[PDB]
């Protein structure tokens, strides 16, 4: 089976460098042209670069020409992308992709197999565990038989964070929103759940927030205010 395992992603300061790797298996690597494609958070696919089977012809997207270098090692069956002078616009998930047919077959080029992707975040922000604050419903609320409560997961870097409720024992009505990037360079997220209004002071609701890049675990009990 064809496999393309990528590695080398992470956080890089603006203006610095990073090398991405794509280890191929299950096909004759050295007779295939290979490509890099990227996708910025919430954006479309964007072609990056191509290298021919023997490494001789390389072409680049307009926005990376000069800065990025594509290369290959046909003995280790590995594709590389050296990324230099990174900007915030280079933040993206980077996929490697294999052409459908050997380079010496003259056909329409299509990308028939893709790697799983590796995330590159270009930012000067320092790693920081999130602060978890309660989104508490009002005690004297009379507006309905359902109440919403939640956790505000604020000021962490980098992505991602995991949010469960009651250690995963509560999944019905749970909405964890995509994170947003604040002007400070830190991410912010909300996870909410709707529950019976009559349950609020009786059933204990705890949001579990884990942030691997800082080894931070926070359990916040959310209770009604006043």
């Amino acid at each position: 089976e064809v496999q393309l395992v990528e590695s080398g992603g992470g956080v890089v300061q603006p203006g610095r460098s990073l090398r991405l790797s794509c280890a191929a298996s299950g096909f004759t690597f050295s007779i295939y042209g290979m490509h890099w494609v990227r996708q910025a958070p919430g954006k479309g696919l964007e072609w990056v670069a191509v290298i021919s089977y023997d490494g001789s012809n390389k072409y680049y997207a307009d926005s990376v020409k000069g800065r990025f270098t594509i290369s290959r090692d046909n003995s280790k069956n590995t594709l590389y992308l050296q990324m230099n002078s990174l900007r915030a616009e280079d933040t993206a998930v980077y996929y490697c992709a294999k052409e459908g047919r050997p380079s010496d077959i003259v056909v329409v080029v299509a990308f028939d197999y893709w790697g799983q992707g590796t995330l590159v975040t270009v930012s000067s922000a320092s790693t920081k565990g999130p602060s978890v604050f309660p989104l508490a419903p009002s005690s004297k609320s009379t507006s309905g038989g359902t109440a919403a409560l939640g956790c505000l997961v604020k000021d962490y870097f980098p992505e991602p964070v995991t949010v469960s409720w009651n250690s995963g024992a509560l999944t019905s009505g749970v909405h964890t929103f995509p994170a947003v990037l604040q002007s400070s360079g830190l991410y912010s997220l909300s996870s909410v759940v709707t529950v019976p209004s009559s349950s609020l002071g009786t059933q204990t609701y705890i949001c579990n927030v884990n942030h691997k890049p800082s080894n931070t675990k926070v359990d916040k009990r959310v209770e009604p205010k006043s």
């Binding site: 479309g44 696919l45 680049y60 299509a110 929103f177």
Partner: protein, 214 residues
Amino acid sequence: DIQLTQSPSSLSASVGDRVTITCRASQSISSYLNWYQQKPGKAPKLLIYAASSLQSGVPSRFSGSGSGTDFTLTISSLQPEDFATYYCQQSYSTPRTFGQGTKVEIKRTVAAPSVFIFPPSDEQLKSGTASVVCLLNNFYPREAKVQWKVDNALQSGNSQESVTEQDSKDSTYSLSSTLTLSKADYEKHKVYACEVTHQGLSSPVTKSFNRGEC
């Protein structure tokens, strides 16, 4: 640079519908156009290559047609696993380019949001910043308008929103909007409110509070 323009940018359809997605190229590219499917957080997959050739293993309900400047991706009977984003891609010249993508979404009945507002916790105020969260829960369609007001003045440039994918159970959207301000500014105003406009609401709905549980 050959430009690929897809249309529509998104469409809502139901299981069993015939769905058609168009891709238009800025210059003739013969049959050098491919189609890809992508699901959130997963790598793209090739569906159609060379305008109309079906990739091995891809179900026969996917077909491509067209040539020159006008191409079509057709799903003859939309299946649940077909809700996804679709991309056309030209291999006629370098650089290779992609369409902006078409999101195929689940169609359902209009549902008004339930609106909730959350004041900042006293715990957050100790750090010097205040967040005020407006939640819009389980609505359809996705389009909605959130207006923040502070002491009855319409705000702009101090909020951020985020919207979930369609819920796996009822195909509705949820939206959270956060108004952020310092503790000093938060203490200088009394009434905080978000006003929601949506197709399911006869009139806009406002959830408000007075600072200090007043």
